[PDB]
Design a protein around this nucleic acid. Structure first.
Ligand code: NA
Ligand code: NA
Length: 151
DNA sequence: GGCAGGGGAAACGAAGCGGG
């Protein structure tokens, strides 16, 4: 195993998670309100108006915000239990990597109450909710990846 | 630590690397 710089470790970590999510989406899509984080020009991650210092802040912020929804995913893939867990843990690893390359920590209790609301919804909305966490996490990560390759 | 960091990767958005 050749040694990887920080940036290289980060690039591989995101490709790892993107792979895991893809595996969950197949288990979702074939078996077929929210304010999920999203990239916007203000964040300065796109080519138009790129700023590294604030982009990295948005990525870490967005990922910390994504954690409640990854926790929600754990009890929606009973057989793919291992795969949801891997996505949840790898993302926590990713945050830890990004925090050394670098703000708004989500409030635990606000998260915990949102979680039990999502968990109480009826099956149909729950299946809708799963699909869009996956889709939106994907897009935040693809965009995070595209960014970080510049930094 | 160590054997090494922090239990375990090219076609037009399929193919296929390690216990306490
Ligand atoms: Na080890
Ligand atoms: Na160890």
């Amino acid at each position: 195993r050749q040694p990887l710089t920080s940036s290289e470790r980060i690039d591989k970590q995101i490709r790892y998670i993107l792979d895991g999510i893809s595996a969950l989406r197949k288990e979702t899509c074939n078996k077929s309100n929210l304010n999920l984080p999203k990239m916007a020009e203000k964040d300065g991650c796109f080519q138009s108006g790129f700023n590294e210092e604030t982009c990295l802040v948005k990525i870490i912020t967005g990922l910390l915000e994504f954690e409640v929804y990854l926790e929600y995913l754990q009890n929606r893939f009973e057989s793919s239990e291992e795969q949801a867990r891997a996505v949840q843990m790898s993302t926590k690893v990713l945050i830890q990597f990004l925090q050394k390359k670098a703000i708004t920590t989500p409030d635990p209790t606000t998260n915990a109450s949102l979680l039990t609301k999502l968990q109480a919804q009826n099956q149909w909305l729950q299946d809708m909710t799963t699909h869009l966490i996956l889709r939106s996490f994907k897009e935040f990560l693809q965009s995070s990846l595209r960014a970080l390759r510049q930094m």
